[PDB]
Design a protein around this ligand. Structure first.
Ligand code: HEC
Ligand code: HEC
Ligand code: HEC
Ligand code: HEC
Ligand SMILES: O=S([O-])[O-]
Length: 208
């Protein structure tokens, strides 16, 4: 089983606070990095060509868009703007099947306070762990600590520069590059629950 990708539109329409915050992160602008003459210095350090247009190179786009190589995902032949940049489904998982449960569950909660178990969403493909997905992009290089590495690899590795060292427990809390967290009403409950969920909700900004 597995759900296809659809893009950021629906998620963004119901979750405007996260979407507006996400919009300003490096992830949202990931495709701009593949354009000619952008990030020239970093590209030279990694021995890449600073003037090359890498926006349609299959050795690069896969980690700068949503669901490359997966059903419903971004393709160089049909590069959907709503799948351009590392977006919502790249971390939360393809949403085709679970976004429907977010709608119905939210309606049920608004009408009667009924909560829905996270177990139902995980069954529909939602990710509440994240490590593996971040790793498929950030730790995808030869000999990396992550067991799933396979080409094409990311040019940006600790070997190129120590700043490219990725540690999940640290980076997932990187407030300068992850979307801000906002308070949830509590529609969903139970396991699997992200290990830092309560920590993030206790420190979250008001839903407004
Ligand atoms: C409106 C019809 C929604 C759409 C479209 C999507 N989501 Fe949703 N989501 C919705 C509700 C009413 C809730 C509960 C909010 C609350 O206050 O409790 C959610 C919740 C989430 C969560 C949090 C899950 C948890 O562990 O508690 C996430 C991470 C989330 N939604 C993500 C998400 C994504 C990526 C979507 C696009 C595929 C998406 N949602 C669509 C309502 C709606
Ligand atoms: C591939 C589809 C990715 C997934 C999944 C995740 N990240 Fe990522 N991240 C990716 C790229 C291509 C970039 C660079 C964007 C650009 O063009 O500039 C990034 C960047 C970050 C950063 C900022 C840079 C840094 O400080 O290291 C952070 C903090 C980051 N990414 C974190 C992160 C986490 C915690 C993820 C899983 C929840 C995650 N990323 C997934 C590509 C991809
Ligand atoms: C996933 C396996 C990737 C492939 C294939 C490529 N890139 Fe990407 N890129 C990836 C990550 C995880 C990051 C973030 C690194 C960090 O920690 O900051 C990036 C980042 C870039 C950047 C920005 C670098 C910086 O600002 O210092 C550029 C310019 C970039 N990537 C270009 C690029 C090109 C041209 C690729 C094909 C040759 C390419 N990347 C592939 C992950 C992945
Ligand atoms: C990986 C780099 C992510 C991207 C891209 C997006 N989100 Fe996210 N989101 C991420 C994490 C690790 C978490 C915490 C999980 C938890 O259960 O605590 C979240 C959480 C949310 C939530 C829950 C409420 C909140 O924390 O604000 C929502 C509604 C949510 N995310 C929505 C969302 C949307 C619409 C995105 C695309 C614009 C999006 N997220 C991208 C990691 C990542
Ligand atoms: O519909 S409720 O989750 O705001």
């Amino acid at each position: 089983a597995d759900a296809p990708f659809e893009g950021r539109k629906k998620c963004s329409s119901c979750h405007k606070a996260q979407a507006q915050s996400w919009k300003d992160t490096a992830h949202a602008k990931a495709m701009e990095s593949l354009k000619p003459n952008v990030k020239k210095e970093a590209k030279q350090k990694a021995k890449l060509d600073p003037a090359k247009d890498y926006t349609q190179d299959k050795d690069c786009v896969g980690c700068h868009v949503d669901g490359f190589g997966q059903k419903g995902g971004y393709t160089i032949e049909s590069p959907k703007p709503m799948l351009t940049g590392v977006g919502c489904e790249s971390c939360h998982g393809p949403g085709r099947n679970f976004r429907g449960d977010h709608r119905k569950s939210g309606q049920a909660f608004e009408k009667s306070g009924k909560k829905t178990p996270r177990k139902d969403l995980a069954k529909k493909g939602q990710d509440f762990h994240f490590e593996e997905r971040c790793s498929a992009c950030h730790l995808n290089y030869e000999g990396s600590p992550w067991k799933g590495a396979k080409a094409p690899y990311t040019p940006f590795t600790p070997e190129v520069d120590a700043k490219y060292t990725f540690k999940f427990d640290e980076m997932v809390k990187e407030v300068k590059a992850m979307h801000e967290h906002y308070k949830l009403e509590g529609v969903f409950e139970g396991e699997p629950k992200f290990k830092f969920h309560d920590e993030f909700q206790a420190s979250a900004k008001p839903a407004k």
